[PDB]
Amino acid sequence: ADKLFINALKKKFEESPEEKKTTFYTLGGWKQSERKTEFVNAGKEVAAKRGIPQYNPDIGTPLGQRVLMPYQVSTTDTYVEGDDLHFVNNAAMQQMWDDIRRTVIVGLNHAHAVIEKRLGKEVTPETITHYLETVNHAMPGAAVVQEHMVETHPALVADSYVKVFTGNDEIADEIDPAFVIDINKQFPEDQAETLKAEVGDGIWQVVRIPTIVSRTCDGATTSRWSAMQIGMSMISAYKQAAGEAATGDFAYAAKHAEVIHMGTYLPVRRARGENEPGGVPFGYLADICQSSRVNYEDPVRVSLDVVATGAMLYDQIWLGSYMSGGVGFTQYATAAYTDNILDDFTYFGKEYVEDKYGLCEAPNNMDTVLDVATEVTFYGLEQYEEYPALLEDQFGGSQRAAVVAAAAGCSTAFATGNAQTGLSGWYLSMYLHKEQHSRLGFYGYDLQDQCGASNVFSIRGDEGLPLELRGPNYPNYAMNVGHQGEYAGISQAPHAARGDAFVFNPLVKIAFADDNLVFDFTNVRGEFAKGALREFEPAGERALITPA
Amino acid sequence: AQYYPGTTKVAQNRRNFCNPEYELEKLREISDEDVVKILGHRAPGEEYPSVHPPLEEMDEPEDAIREMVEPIDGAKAGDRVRYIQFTDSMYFAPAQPYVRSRAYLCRYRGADAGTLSGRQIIETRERDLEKISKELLETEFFDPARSGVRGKSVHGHSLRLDEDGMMFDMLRRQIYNKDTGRVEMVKNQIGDELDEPVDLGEPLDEETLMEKTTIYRVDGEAYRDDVEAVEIMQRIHVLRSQGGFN
Amino acid sequence: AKFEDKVDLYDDRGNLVEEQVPLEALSPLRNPAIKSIVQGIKRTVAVNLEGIENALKTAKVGGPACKIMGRELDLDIVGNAESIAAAAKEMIQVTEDDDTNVELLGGGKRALVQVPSARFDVAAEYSAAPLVTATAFVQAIINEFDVSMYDANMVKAAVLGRYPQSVEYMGANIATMLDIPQKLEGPGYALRNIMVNHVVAATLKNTLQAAALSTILEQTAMFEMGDAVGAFERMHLLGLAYQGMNADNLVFDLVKANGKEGTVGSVIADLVERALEDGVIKVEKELTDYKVYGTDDLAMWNAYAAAGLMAATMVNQGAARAAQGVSSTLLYYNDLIEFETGLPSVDFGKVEGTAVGFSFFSHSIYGGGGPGIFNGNHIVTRHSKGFAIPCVAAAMALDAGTQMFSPEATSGLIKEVFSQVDEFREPLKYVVEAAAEIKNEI
Amino acid sequence: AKFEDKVDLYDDRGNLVEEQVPLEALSPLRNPAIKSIVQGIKRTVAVNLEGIENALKTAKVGGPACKIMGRELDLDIVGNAESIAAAAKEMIQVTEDDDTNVELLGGGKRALVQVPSARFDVAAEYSAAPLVTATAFVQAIINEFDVSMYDANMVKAAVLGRYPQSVEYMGANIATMLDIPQKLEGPGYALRNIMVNHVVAATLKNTLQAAALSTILEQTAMFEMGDAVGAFERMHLLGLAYQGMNADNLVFDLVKANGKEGTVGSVIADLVERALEDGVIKVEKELTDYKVYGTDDLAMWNAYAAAGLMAATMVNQGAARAAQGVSSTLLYYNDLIEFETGLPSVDFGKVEGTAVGFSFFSHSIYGGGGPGIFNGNHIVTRHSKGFAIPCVAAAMALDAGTQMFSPEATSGLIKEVFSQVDEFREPLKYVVEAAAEIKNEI
Numbered sequence A: 001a002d003k004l005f006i007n008a009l010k011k012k013f014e015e016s017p018e019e020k021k022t023t024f025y026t027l028g029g030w031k032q033s034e035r036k037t038e039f040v041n042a043g044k045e046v047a048a049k050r051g052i053p054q055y056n057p058d059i060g061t062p063l064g065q066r067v068l069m070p071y072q073v074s075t076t077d078t079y080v081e082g083d084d085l086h087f088v089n090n091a092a093m094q095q096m097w098d099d100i101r102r103t104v105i106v107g108l109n110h111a112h113a114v115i116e117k118r119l120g121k122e123v124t125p126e127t128i129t130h131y132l133e134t135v136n137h138a139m140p141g142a143a144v145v146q147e148h149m150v151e152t153h154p155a156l157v158a159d160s161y162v163k164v165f166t167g168n169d170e171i172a173d174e175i176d177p178a179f180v181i182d183i184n185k186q187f188p189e190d191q192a193e194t195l196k197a198e199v200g201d202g203i204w205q206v207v208r209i210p211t212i213v214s215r216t217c218d219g220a221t222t223s224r225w226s227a228m229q230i231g232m233s234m235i236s237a238y239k240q241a242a243g244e245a246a247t248g249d250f251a252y253a254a255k256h257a258e259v260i261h262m263g264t265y266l267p268v269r270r271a272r273g274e275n276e277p278g279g280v281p282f283g284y285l286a287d288i289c290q291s292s293r294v295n296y297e298d299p300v301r302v303s304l305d306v307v308a309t310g311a312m313l314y315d316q317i318w319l320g321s322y323m324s325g326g327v328g329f330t331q332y333a334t335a336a337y338t339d340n341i342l343d344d345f346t347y348f349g350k351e352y353v354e355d356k357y358g359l360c361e362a363p364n365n366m367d368t369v370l371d372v373a374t375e376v377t378f379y380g381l382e383q384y385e386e387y388p389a390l391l392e393d394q395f396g397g398s399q400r401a402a403v404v405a406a407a408a409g410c411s412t413a414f415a416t417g418n419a420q421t422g423l424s425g426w427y428l429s430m431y432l433h434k435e436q437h438s439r440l441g442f443y444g445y446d447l448q449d450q451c452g453a454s455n456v457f458s459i460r461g462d463e464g465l466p467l468e469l470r471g472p473n474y475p476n477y478a479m480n481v482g483h484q485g486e487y488a489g490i491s492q493a494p495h496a497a498r499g500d501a502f503v504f505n506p507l508v509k510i511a512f513a514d515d516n517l518v519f520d521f522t523n524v525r526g527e528f529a530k531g532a533l534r535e536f537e538p539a540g541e542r543a544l545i546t547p548a
Numbered sequence B: 001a002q003y004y005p006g007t008t009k010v011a012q013n014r015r016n017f018c019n020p021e022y023e024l025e026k027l028r029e030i031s032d033e034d035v036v037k038i039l040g041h042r043a044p045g046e047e048y049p050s051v052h053p054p055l056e057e058m059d060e061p062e063d064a065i066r067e068m069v070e071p072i073d074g075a076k077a078g079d080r081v082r083y084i085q086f087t088d089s090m091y092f093a094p095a096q097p098y099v100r101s102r103a104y105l106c107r108y109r110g111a112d113a114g115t116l117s118g119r120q121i122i123e124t125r126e127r128d129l130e131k132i133s134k135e136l137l138e139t140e141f142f143d144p145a146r147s148g149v150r151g152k153s154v155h156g157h158s159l160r161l162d163e164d165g166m167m168f169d170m171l172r173r174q175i176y177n178k179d180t181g182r183v184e185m186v187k188n189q190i191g192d193e194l195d196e197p198v199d200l201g202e203p204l205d206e207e208t209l210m211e212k213t214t215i216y217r218v219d220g221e222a223y224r225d226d227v228e229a230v231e232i233m234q235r236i237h238v239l240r241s242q243g244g245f246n
Numbered sequence C, D: 001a002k003f004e005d006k007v008d009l010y011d012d013r014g015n016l017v018e019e020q021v022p023l024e025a026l027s028p029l030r031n032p033a034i035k036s037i038v039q040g041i042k043r044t045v046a047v048n049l050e051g052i053e054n055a056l057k058t059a060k061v062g063g064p065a066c067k068i069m070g071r072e073l074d075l076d077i078v079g080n081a082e083s084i085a086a087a088a089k090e091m092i093q094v095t096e097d098d099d100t101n102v103e104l105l106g107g108g109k110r111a112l113v114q115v116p117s118a119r120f121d122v123a124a125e126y127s128a129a130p131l132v133t134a135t136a137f138v139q140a141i142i143n144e145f146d147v148s149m150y151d152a153n154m155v156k157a158a159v160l161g162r163y164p165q166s167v168e169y170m171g172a173n174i175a176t177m178l179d180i181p182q183k184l185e186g187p188g189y190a191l192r193n194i195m196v197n198h199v200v201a202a203t204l205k206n207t208l209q210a211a212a213l214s215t216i217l218e219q220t221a222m223f224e225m226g227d228a229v230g231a232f233e234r235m236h237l238l239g240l241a242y243q244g245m246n247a248d249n250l251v252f253d254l255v256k257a258n259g260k261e262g263t264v265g266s267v268i269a270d271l272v273e274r275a276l277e278d279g280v281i282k283v284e285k286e287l288t289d290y291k292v293y294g295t296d297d298l299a300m301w302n303a304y305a306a307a308g309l310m311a312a313t314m315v316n317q318g319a320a321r322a323a324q325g326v327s328s329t330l331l332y333y334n335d336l337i338e339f340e341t342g343l344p345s346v347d348f349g350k351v352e353g354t355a356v357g358f359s360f361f362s363h364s365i366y367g368g369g370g371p372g373i374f375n376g377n378h379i380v381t382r383h384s385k386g387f388a389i390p391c392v393a394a395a396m397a398l399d400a401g402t403q404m405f406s407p408e409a410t411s412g413l414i415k416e417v418f419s420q421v422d423e424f425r426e427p428l429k430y431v432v433e434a435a436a437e438i439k440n441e442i
């Protein structure tokens, strides 16, 4: 069948994708683009209303001396200009991050122990349901004990709620099913049995605070807001004194002893509290993405859905705004989720490994890394050489480096069933690419790349970590675009090839298996395309409280 | 010195750019004035601006390292550090980004070289930069169709050539003339119009590009068939991997 | 000596050990036993070899509920504890037969490790203890079993957790009484970020030894913070001696007098009487049926009032055998004594303010928890400069089982290793013996 | 001795000082001069008495552009410096004949303070230096002028800034080479958070001495981090000796041979020839007109390549007298040497990778700055384990005035005070003397 990027390349350019020559300078600059024309008109309108110049297409250099391309969102049939994939212009991308930032997982294990042992009251499915009715009134910001409380408007905070899950089916089925993430409904049988075995008789809350609060405030608000309203609801539902010594054990349990943040806090140069993107380890990002429970027949699809999740969050929002800003890093990330390019390379490598070894049947060693990563690197690079339209599409070397090395590292991990050798294959890919074309990425692209080989298997204090546990705060990774979302894909790759239900935390995997989320984590690239088309409906808006 | 493994023309060309004993082929003559104009840092007859006073005016303490290391002439004078930056087409330009930084640090003294996919730069003291720049412009480091002198707006290394065989340039600093076949530099490297254009000679024909290129490609010499060069890359990978462990 | 004061030193049974020892013999800057306790707490690490082995066999590494399917390694680390420990000790030590200690406990399930003090005299801080310990155990595990390059990173994760993606050693199977330098509320706070339950576990819930260890650590931090420099130094030393060291047997004797039937208020009445008997306070003015007391020695009044405050905690929380009310004792001993006398309460109101927030954050939804999880670096309990936390330590030592987050719950690894060390366990014995030994050199 | 290696040690003029010194005599764990340097940098504070006086007179306290109208206090601090310094010293010292130093400079406008070592042996970390110094000078200034209770908090703000509202001493008029413990990227990093410009200023831009001080601090941090424990120890000691201590005169002799007309590439050719001549590498395999080199001692190959890298920086940035190209030298020295030889570059690629990001963050819009503002704790330059930042120090020592953020701009207070201290200013001298002294104890 044609390579998977050919339809996109025929949509973008009039020439055939193999054609080496074109014409430039004849498209009228920005005037060729619907979106730039919208921007030029909006800038005139903004500047005139506010009395300060703003967007002006004649500032600096004239965009569109070449074709300003559409991009196909991979796995979709939606083609949009890249400005529609900028996170500022894409409400689905903003809501994806809000839905992670505003979530926290909070055990009821220590809490129920405090109730039984310290207050001397019984817990059963019935008392749990009554506590859940109470906390779903209180969590969005409404009162249960005091007189003369003033409360949040329920429609502004409609996205905030609490659900629970447990690995004990008979206990799950006794709690009111309005509040339950049903593992058996959400996961195919084998993954459901794995997840339930991990959870056991433990009972956990998934708490989502309001998007309007998360946007007002920060990620470190989430576990606090969660615990306040858990605390009020434990007072009201189990009939405590409203503020006695035992109250503080529910606070410590919900805020510290049985909380699981999405992200850990950051060191001072990049100071941030919990539940910010830099704290989210790669294994958690693969677990947040829900492609694993829907597309499990196709480990390439699962892995590259995780790459899309991560390239957007880690390069566009985190590195391209929290850690920099401006125009930012849209196409550094779009290279990994558009035009079916990474998909073409990664299916090639998956089939190569199937034919030579069998998925997960290769020895977990450097021989396998050298064989698979080299073969897949050369395939990817040959496509840019055979198709000048493909090279002009992924015009920055960093974009190519990330795409070729993601396909090489995911394919190596499909062979070995182990993410560490996948990561060695990523670095070998960069070294071969650099020598093949006498270039790689931007000035600073390969800081982690050159430290890379030596730190894959190191065991030293700030060097040695399995890839699943690394994240944007692993020292070598803390700065640069074109790596973090691809590493989350490599962390997913061996687990999707093995059919594992999760990559690093089963509670995080379950916690996003929930259609009450605003963003649909089962189809990240589909949602990105919906947002690009201005068809996604986010939470958090102030329309109800502002002039009509 | 050996410089680079491999048995292709690409490999030998990578070694020749690094080797200061290899005489770079001169392809074109450019006047001193025109190198100055293309750099764009100062006007013809303008004295070299200074960033600090001449070394002899500074009366420094005894330092055995400084006493052993001879300063380049622009450092003795206190010249500004300025730059020259080139973009090389992936369609078989003779030099390429890492080839340039590796070569510059073997050939040139007092050099700050930077490599990127779409641009490669050297920064050094201004009067010394003008002497190196003549060599980068006059020799087979440069082709006037497939290489561009560009301080900003560098896009084009990865683009399709136009119908004349010229790399894309958002700011059209180098113009091929359809009737004559020569390229002229019509703007300096930052994109400002030159009073008079600089002739940069004829684009190298396809055969000569293939003789002189340092990029590996499936339609030229493929890197994967230069098995000795791949062996050394793989060796480096494996030795760094084992050494980081134990 | 800079100061003229002398104190009489007693043992933990209330028996005299040494008379008329100069106050500065108890100073953290002079007493060699306080130096060896602080250096020991810098350098001591608890290694949970059974936890490492279990994390490896299950691939449960990197923090709560985390697991990597397919990464399990089944290594017989506890069965080979002696060899692993010896190989780690050879990397930990600087020279053979220096002060490095590596001792197995619980049939090889745990190791007490004391990294050589010389590594700290060439270090900025104290992180060499967990870092040098973790790497020596990671390498000795890998070398014991010939763990491959491909798998060794799981040994690392099972030892030290998610570091460096997380700032802390999240999920580590090693433990220290100190916590990482980034978590200090201010420079100089490291000896304050020691959980009260750790102090009570290491002293085996001996009430006077838990109070002494906590006061040592708190008042030693007040030197490192600069608070006990210059004008304030004597106030801090007299607090150490009278509230933490049982100087003059004053905490002991107030507890003896009030333990059978006493309250916080009966202890206040006894301490005001004893301060007037000893000339620490005097009647300054008579109002209508009320005497206004004054003092010519605010540091000494503070110290007597601090001894009373400790005795009142031991009476009130000892009577309940329930630690929670320590927050109330710390508040109302100070509030009551100010309206009883007209003189300022302990730490000039800062114990009372610490107690207001501590009471709130141990009885509310907003944060905190039970007494045992506080420490001098906790935002709720940092505000008094050493005079509050040791009372919390005494109250948790007296708690007979009312807490969920007890020292048995939070501090079991710490207990098994740190209580081995005689000077951490019974620091009142060793600090008093060292003060008597140096008495004529101060 | 754990290691059999011996090295010859030279002074900064290339003359032999001592032959055949055991490697561990240079270890931070054994060498007494490295101990005195590290305890010195923990305990030494620069006090800007003029800056305190000016901040008070204008009420400009609390950080850039901040001022409190109506709070101005005009105190003759510099004219009474001798008295103020003596009173601060009495509070700083532990005893009258200890190693506290308080010395006025600049006619009383500045003071060098060295807080007594013993305060640190009973401290967790190093913040007692600024905190004990700050309060002793705040108290001494208050007591010199009898500043009232209502005004004294302005003296505190002028000395220590906006702390504790800010985490740092924001607006302080004291300075140290270390920075606060909360700013460490990881535990064990404090000796790495020392600006390159502070090292170059303390050593008066003597290139070899700047490279030595930087190396001593970086490799001593490697011990505190646990990196130099076990398998890696010899690699770190040999890097210290050859890259920072000019062992065997290797750096010196490379620079001598390449200084007149040399490049990074000529220094590589000479180092490869010297490694071959010394037996550190040998030809393993012949490819087509290409010799593949091997080694049976990767730590020694790494060290020789590290000495070459320092020489290449001296040649390259010495010829330009401009530091910026150190990021390029650190990159392409390592990239060229691997394709020249078939062996891994310094620190197995981690100098090269540090240099890629350092080059980017010294020539782009995103962060970083000029070479002198980096340090081993900086996110851009932390990745190599001691083998990159000393080259940056050498390059800034050789810079003739191309930097806006030069040591004169960022480190003038540091320079005046810390270059007074002989062991900080000329550490190559003292560490080599101490190594020769303990030669027979290893």
Ligand code: F43
Binding pocket: A325, A326, A327, A328, A329, A330, A331, A332, A333, A395, A396, A397, A398, A399, A440, A441, A442, A443, B116, B117, B118, B119, B151, B152, B153, B154, B155, B156, B157, B158, D363, D364, D365, D366
């Ligand atoms: C000024 C810099 C230096 C710097 O610190 N950042 C710049 C510019 C910055 C700006 C450019 C916005 C603008 O035009 O005003 C932004 C968008 C960051 C921001 N401030 O919002 C950016 N780069 Ni850059 N930058 C990019 C890239 C690149 C590629 C472009 C090569 C080419 O041939 O076109 C090269 C590096 C390389 O050669 O590998 C590059 C250089 C550069 N990058 C050169 C300018 C190059 C030029 O003069 O043309 N970027 C890329 O390779 C692709 C992604 C792209 C980013 C925007 C997006 O992700 O959508 C953008 C990311």
Ligand SMILES: C[C@@H](OP(=O)(O)O)[C@H](NC(=O)CCCCCCS)C(=O)O
Binding pocket: A224, A255, C361, C366, C367, C368, C369, C379, C380
């Ligand atoms: C004490 C501390 O909580 P922890 O004991 O760390 O759980 C802290 N909260 C607070 O200070 C709550 C302040 C606002 C609520 C009470 C206002 S009176 C915090 O979350 O960091």
Ligand SMILES: C[C@@H](OP(=O)(O)O)[C@H](NC(=O)CCCCCCS)C(=O)O
Binding pocket: A269, A270, A319, A320, A323, A324, A444, A478, A479, A480, A481, D361, D366, D367, D368, D369, D379, D380
């Ligand atoms: C280096 C550091 O900047 P400073 O040197 O501290 O100014 C850091 N920025 C970054 O890492 C930029 C990362 C994203 C922009 C570059 C992506 S390649 C930060 O702001 O904390």
Ligand SMILES: O=S(=O)(O)CCS
Binding pocket: A442, A443, A444, B116, D360, D363, D364, D365
């Ligand atoms: O040109 S740079 O590599 O510095 C920045 C790329 S976005």
Ligand SMILES: [Mg+2]
Binding pocket: none
């Ligand atoms: Mg083949």
Ligand SMILES: [Mg+2]
Binding pocket: A515, A520
């Ligand atoms: Mg839906």
Ligand SMILES: [Mg+2]
Binding pocket: B029, B030, B031, B032
């Ligand atoms: Mg000429």
Ligand SMILES: [Mg+2]
Binding pocket: C249
């Ligand atoms: Mg008696």
Ligand SMILES: [Mg+2]
Binding pocket: D286
């Ligand atoms: Mg031969």
Ligand SMILES: [Zn+2]
Binding pocket: A214, A215, A216, A217, A218
């Ligand atoms: Zn926000």
